[PDB]
Structures are given as structure tokens and as C-alpha cells.
Amino acid sequence: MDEIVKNIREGTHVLLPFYETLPELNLSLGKSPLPSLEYGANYFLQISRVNDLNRMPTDMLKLFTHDIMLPESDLDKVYEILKINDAVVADLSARNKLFKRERDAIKSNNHLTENNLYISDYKMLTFDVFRPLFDFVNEKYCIIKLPTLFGRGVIDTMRIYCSLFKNVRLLKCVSDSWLKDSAIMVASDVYKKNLDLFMSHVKSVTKSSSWKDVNTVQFSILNDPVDTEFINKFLEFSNRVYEALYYVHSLLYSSMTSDSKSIENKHQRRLVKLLL
Known part of the structure; x- marks a missing residue:
């Protein structure tokens, strides 16, 4: 598809809307909300x-991705383009990493037990995604590199930010990894009314007015699902990213499973042209 290659080679983005009214908050620390089909989970595309x-x-x-894992430099460029030197920032990404631990092949007759990759892993989305709001004061931008677009928590989190800031953009940069479902949220033009309501809620739970890393855990924050319309606008973005990832990962898998049984094959070659 030409939309896949356009997205990988130029980037893509969606603008999300502003919601005057903050949903009902109910922060809970320990476990994140489950992925669900209501929140756009698509196991054939995403997983x-x-x-x-x-x-x-x-x-x-490691071997078949050596030449296409680049240093991820998307946040540095975002800084430059927005002539930043201001902005509060958080990076929940796994910069220059693909897998979590060395592991052998899983045998054919064994069904997969946990996710070893930093891809489509909703558990990467820890409560420090809201760390930038604590040391917020008068900054024009809140920039977050998200680690995943998978699951319910990342959508509920973007819904909260969309009440806190009046301009929220979701994007994926050319200089990010297109092996992974990371993305950047750029918010600007804060809305103090709701920043204050949010922080009051959060502080009554953590019972501290400054950040503690012990609170970098998984979490859930909303109860009632969000307006179907909102999920759908998110998926306008995440569908395009997962569609590009799907092709990327298909070339990689085909290469790693080629009859050639070597790293020099038609799929590996096409994957290099795509990503570099």
C-alpha cells in the first residue's frame, strides 16, 4: 500500500479534540485496564x-534486525522543530531496545505465555505518563513519547490529556522506530481548571504533591468507557501505525522464515529499503 510507505517515510498524525469536561476520575495504582474490543483491540492486526x-x-x-534498528531520535527532532531550549517531557519508550530478555525459540507445540517484545505491550504504560503534570508550571508544551498504542489505558490517558490541553496532536515520526508501536503526544495551551481538578484527584491518592518513582506502576484512571467517537479518532491514527507495523513485521517474519534460510533474501532486502 502507498499509505503504508507514505506513513513510514513521511510520518503521520491525528489531531484530537478538546473536552471542556473532565471525565470522572478514579485513579487506582497496580494494574492497568484490560485491552478490549470496545477499545479497538484487533488481535489479527495488532498482535x-x-x-x-x-x-x-x-x-x-537480534541478527535479522541489526541493520534496521536505528538510534531513535524522534523527541530530539520534536524539540528542534518546536525551538525548545519551554516544555515538560516524559519518555516511556524502550529506546533502542526490541526484546526484554534473551530467550530460546518457543517450541511449536507450546503456546505463547508472555510478551518478550517492546511491541503492543499495554503494560509498558506506567503512571509516570502523568509525571510531566507534577513539575508543570507555565510550560507551553507537554510532550510525551508513548511506548504503545495497544490496550485501553493508552486511550483513557489521551482522553484525560485532551481535557488538560486545548491542542493535542498524536504523531509518529520518521526517525522513530517503525518496528515498534511508539508515538509522541504533543499537547499545548493548558487549561488550568482541569489541570487543577486532575492534580487534586491524583494528590489525594498518592498523598504527595511531588512525584515518587515508587508510583511508576501500571494503573487505571477512568471507569466509564470513553465516547465511541473518541476511540475511533484514536484508531484513525493507531490503525495506520499498526497497518505499517504489520507490513514491516511481515517482511521480517518472511525473511526470518525464508526458504533461502539466510539473511540475504528478497524479503530482508525489501525490508531494508522500506526502513532506511
Whole structure:
């Protein structure tokens, strides 16, 4: 598809709307909300190639991705383009990492037990995604590199930010990894009314007015799902990212499973042109 290659090679973005009214808050620390089909979970698009690459040996994943893992430099460029030197920032990404631990092939007859990759992992989304709001004061921008677009928590989190700031953009940069479902939120033009209501709620729970890293855990914050319309506008973005990832990961899997049984094959070659 030409939209896949356009997105990988130029980037893509969505503008999200401003919601005067903050949803009912109910921060809870420990466990994140579950992915669900109501929140746009699509296991064939978002997950199935990830399960294939999980099941490979990490030594082999390392080899077949050596030449296409670049240093992720998307936040540095975002700073530059927005002539920042201001802005509060958080990075929940796994910069220059793809897998969490060395692991052998999972045998054919064994079904996958946990996600070893930093891809489509809703558990990466820890409560420090709201760390920038504590040391917020008078900054024009709140920039967050998200680690995933998978699951319910990342959508509920963008819904909160969309009441806190009047201009919220979700994007994925050319100089991010297109092996991973990371993205950047750029918010600007804060709305004190709700920043204050949010922080009051959060502080009555953590019972501290400054950040403690012990609170960098998984979390849930909303109860009632969000307006279907909002999920759908998010998916306008995440669908395009997962569609690009799906092709990327399909080339990789085809290469790693080629009859050639070598790293020089038609799929590996096409994957290099795509990403570099």
C-alpha cells in the first residue's frame, strides 16, 4: 500500500479534540485496564505478527534486525522543530531496545505465555505518563513519547490529556522506530481548571504533591468507557501505525522464515529499503 510507505517515510498524525469536561476520575495504582474490543483491540492486526516474532529465538531476532534498528531520535527532532531550549517531557519508550530478555525459540507445540517484545505491550504504560503534570508550571508544551498504542489505558490517558490541553496532536515520526508501536503526544495551551481538578484527584491518592518513582506502576484512571467517537479518532491514527507495523513485521517474519534460510533474501532486502 502507498499509505503504508507514505506513513513510514513521511510520518503521520491525528489531531484530537478538546473536552471542556473532565471525565470522572478514579485513579487506582497496580494494574492497568484490560485491552478490549470496545477499545479497538484487533488481535489479527495488532498482535499476530508480534506473536510470530516472540516465538523466534532472540539471538535470531537480534541478527535479522541489526541493520534496521536505528538510534531513535524522534523527541530530539520534536524539540528542534518546536525551538525548545519551554516544555515538560516524559519518555516511556524502550529506546533502542526490541526484546526484554534473551530467550530460546518457543517450541511449536507450546503456546505463547508472555510478551518478550517492546511491541503492543499495554503494560509498558506506567503512571509516570502523568509525571510531566507534577513539575508543570507555565510550560507551553507537554510532550510525551508513548511506548504503545495497544490496550485501553493508552486511550483513557489521551482522553484525560485532551481535557488538560486545548491542542493535542498524536504523531509518529520518521526517525522513530517503525518496528515498534511508539508515538509522541504533543499537547499545548493548558487549561488550568482541569489541570487543577486532575492534580487534586491524583494528590489525594498518592498523598504527595511531588512525584515518587515508587508510583511508576501500571494503573487505571477512568471507569466509564470513553465516547465511541473518541476511540475511533484514536484508531484513525493507531490503525495506520499498526497497518505499517504489520507490513514491516511481515517482511521480517518472511525473511526470518525464508526458504533461502539466510539473511540475504528478497524479503530482508525489501525490508531494508522500506526502513532506511
